Amino acid sequence: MQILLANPRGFCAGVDRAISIVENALAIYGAPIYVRHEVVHNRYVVDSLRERGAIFIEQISEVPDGAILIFSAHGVSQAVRNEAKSRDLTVFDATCPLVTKVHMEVARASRRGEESILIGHAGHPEVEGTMGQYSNPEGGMYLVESPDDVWKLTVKNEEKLSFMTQTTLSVDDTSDVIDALRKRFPKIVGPRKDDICYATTNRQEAVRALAEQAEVVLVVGSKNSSNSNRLAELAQRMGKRAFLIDDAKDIQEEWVKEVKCVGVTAGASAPDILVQNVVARLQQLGGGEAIPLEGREENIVFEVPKELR
Numbered sequence: 001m002q003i004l005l006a007n008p009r010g011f012c013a014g015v016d017r018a019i020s021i022v023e024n025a026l027a028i029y030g031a032p033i034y035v036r037h038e039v040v041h042n043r044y045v046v047d048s049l050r051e052r053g054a055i056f057i058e059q060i061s062e063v064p065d066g067a068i069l070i071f072s073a074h075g076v077s078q079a080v081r082n083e084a085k086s087r088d089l090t091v092f093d094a095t096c097p098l099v100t101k102v103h104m105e106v107a108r109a110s111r112r113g114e115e116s117i118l119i120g121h122a123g124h125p126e127v128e129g130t131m132g133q134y135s136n137p138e139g140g141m142y143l144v145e146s147p148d149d150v151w152k153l154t155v156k157n158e159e160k161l162s163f164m165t166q167t168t169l170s171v172d173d174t175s176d177v178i179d180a181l182r183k184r185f186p187k188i189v190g191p192r193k194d195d196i197c198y199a200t201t202n203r204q205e206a207v208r209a210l211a212e213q214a215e216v217v218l219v220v221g222s223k224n225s226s227n228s229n230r231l232a233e234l235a236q237r238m239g240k241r242a243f244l245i246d247d248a249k250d251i252q253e254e255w256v257k258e259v260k261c262v263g264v265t266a267g268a269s270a271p272d273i274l275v276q277n278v279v280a281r282l283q284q285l286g287g288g289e290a291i292p293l294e295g296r297e298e299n300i301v302f303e304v305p306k307e308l309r
């Protein structure tokens with residue numbers, strides 16, 4: 001069995017920053033450090049940080065006075081932020097710069113009382129945080145997940161309309177949603193393409209190349225990782241068996257029995273050590289040397305705040 005590794009895979013700049021923010025905070029101030037939501041959607045990362053004294057909460061009312069609070073990479077609403085800001089808490093923001101970018105555009109539109117549509121998945125913390133930047137009741141903020149959602153949306157003023165997206169969506173599906181927005185709302189304004197980040201785009205392109213060669217694709221990532229789920233789905237839509245797995249123990253032998261070529265990738269929140277262990281397990285199951293595919297070079301790094309060096 002041949003083992004192929006997707007490229008790029010694994011950690012993006014936002015995840016590496018966000019985890020570093022929590023680690024550094026722990027080093028500097030000691031336990032406990034409170035974190036609003038899982039810092040990234042990865043069980044191994046989260047369990048590790050919890051073992052070191054990070055306490056993960058959903059609501060700010062769970063955090064005691066005087067405490068250090070870190071917002072997760074996914075971002076937070078203005079309401080959450082103001083709810084923290086009014087309290088005695090020392091806040092560090094691990095929100096990925098590429099999510100903040102979208103937040104600022106929503107805020108701009110709200111200031112103008114002009115309606116905005118976000119493309120994204122209901123209930124995801126990034127969607128809650130981005131929708132949560134809009135507060136002007138004279139305008140409006142609408143969530144759409146599909147062309148069908150576009151087809152039934154009505155707005156108050158379609159002459160003054162803009163759209164934004166979640167950073168981790170399917171590039172292909174999002175393109176269909178945008179085509180629908182533009183047919184329904186010909187004057188809608190957006191970015192040139194979408195707000196899908198470089199890392200999401202690149203991993204999706206990489207898993208497409210992988211799935212062209214591999215019969216089976218393993219995506220290292222947790223169940224609640226949006227971007228990780230998109231990688232698995234992409235592979236599945238190409239007719240390959242694909243599994244989203246937290247670690248090597250999750251691999252079932254039937255999945256790779258008599259498979260001549262297995263591919264491995266990792267979502268943006270999955271540490272490389274998890275991939276190494278997955279490879280080690282595939283080798284126990286008869287795989288040879290892991291072969292990295294040729295891939296687009298990524299070179300972006302986001303630094304921690306100077307307050308946390």
Ligand SMILES: O=P(O)(O)OP(=O)(O)OCc1ccncc1
Pocket residue numbers: 014015039040041042073074075096099126167168224225226227228267268269
């Ligand atoms: O893919 P997810 O949105 O569920 O988050 P994740 O798996 O934690 O990846 C990091 C991240 C954070 C912020 N925006 C994009 C990606």
Ligand code: F3S
Pocket residue numbers: 012013014015073096097098099167168197198199200227268
């Ligand atoms: S939005 Fe940021 S957290 Fe990673 S997946 Fe994209 S660089």
